[model samples]
Target: SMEQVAMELRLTELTRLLRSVLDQLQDKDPARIFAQPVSLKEVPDYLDHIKHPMDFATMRKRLEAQGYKNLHEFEEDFDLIIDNCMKYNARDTVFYRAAVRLRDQGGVVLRQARREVDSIG
Candidate 1:
């Protein structure tokens, strides 16, 4: 029915977005950032609990020190790291899904930090 069609359409859009992001990351850094031996099962929790504010803080400071004029520049690199994680885990379908979710959650926290830093400066 129409509902099923809409669901499929949304899924297609999501898949396209995921592929697009991963492709960009592949171009930027084919090495993939999260290529370590970490288990995909721990990615979401690790990103959420351990990496969020601390990593964002370090990123903000480093970018500021590097003379980044705005949040967008920093965010481009930030998104690249996210895409790298997704691509690294893309070999397994289950890992791909979890990596996408991890990326989304990291985006939220990083975006908020961007806003705060922009407001401060």
Candidate 2:
């Protein structure tokens, strides 16, 4: 139940942040740059090329060494952490954490997820 709650809360927080990011993109100068909207559910796409040296594999190895096998296996932990963050009004922290996790893992390749979040108009 806690995991489910966390996942739902994180989804809500992520949807809000994703929409904000898209809004920022829409307001920028199109001639000087190109922009596209992305979705929180399709987050793996965003993590494909953008990566750092301290990647997911390394983290996975460390985790495995400590007894954890795969990241997916710890989904409940991840979900709970995100949910707790949302409860405290720390969506940004969860967003950054998701970004970091993706960047740390090996590259994922996919098109940018479509942005469908509604604005506050």
Candidate 3:
């Protein structure tokens, strides 16, 4: 239907924006820290530090589940994914730096989300 096409374009930018962000984070995780959830057994203390832990696999799952209704909600989850690392690891560690880099580059993709979504709509 014609109406479906409009939404397809409207949502297109958001979908494109997120895929872009997802790709950016991959470089920051060379050691695979963001690949999966923090281990409960491997890092038993993780739960103590990161109350709201997040990971790439899980974020991808959420993205697959309708993208949290909008970008801001997805943004929160993105922030949590990086923040959990930044909060738990020391500045001296690569994990912390990865989070820092992810945070910086993320702004680039996020900035386009609003403009593209609005201009096209």
Candidate 4:
């Protein structure tokens, strides 16, 4: 029925949007550091500095698992990844600068997709 059709359509659209955003960020990172979760052994103080950790890999897993209910939810995780980077690294550091760029580009990409999805249904 249209109900199942609607749900499937919505999920597919949202999933595509999320994957594109993740790819853009993964490509943006100089070292692809945000591509995966931070290692406790590599950065013992990671959790100490960041209350919540997020990464592209985790987001992709959640996306594939259909854990996200809406575009906002997916973008929230995206924001978390960028926010965590800025919060953990100093303003002068490379990670911090990368976050700034991602934040700016991320804002535009997300809002544009939001507009598209808004008119879709």
TM-scores vs. true structure, each candidate: 0.37, 0.25, 0.78, 0.85
* Tens-digit lDDT string for candidate 3 (49-68): 88999888888887665566
Steric clashes per prediction:
0, 3, 0, 0
Superposed on all Cα atoms, the candidates' RMSDs to the truth, in angstroms, are 16.1, 17.3, 2.8, 1.9
How does model 3 score by TM-score? 0.78
Model 4: lDDT of residue 87: 84
Report the number of backbone clashes for model 1. 0
Runs in model 2 deviating more than 4 A are 29-121
Q: Give the number of the best model, judged by lDDT.
A: 4
Q: How far off is residue 42 in model 1, in Å? A: 22
Error of 4 at 3 (Å): 3.0
TM-score for model 1?
0.37
Evaluated against the true structure, the overall lDDT of model 2 is 0.35
Candidate 2 lDDT, tens digit per residue, 30-70? 22111222333765544353322222233334343433322
CA lDDT of each prediction against the hidden true structure: 0.48, 0.35, 0.78, 0.82
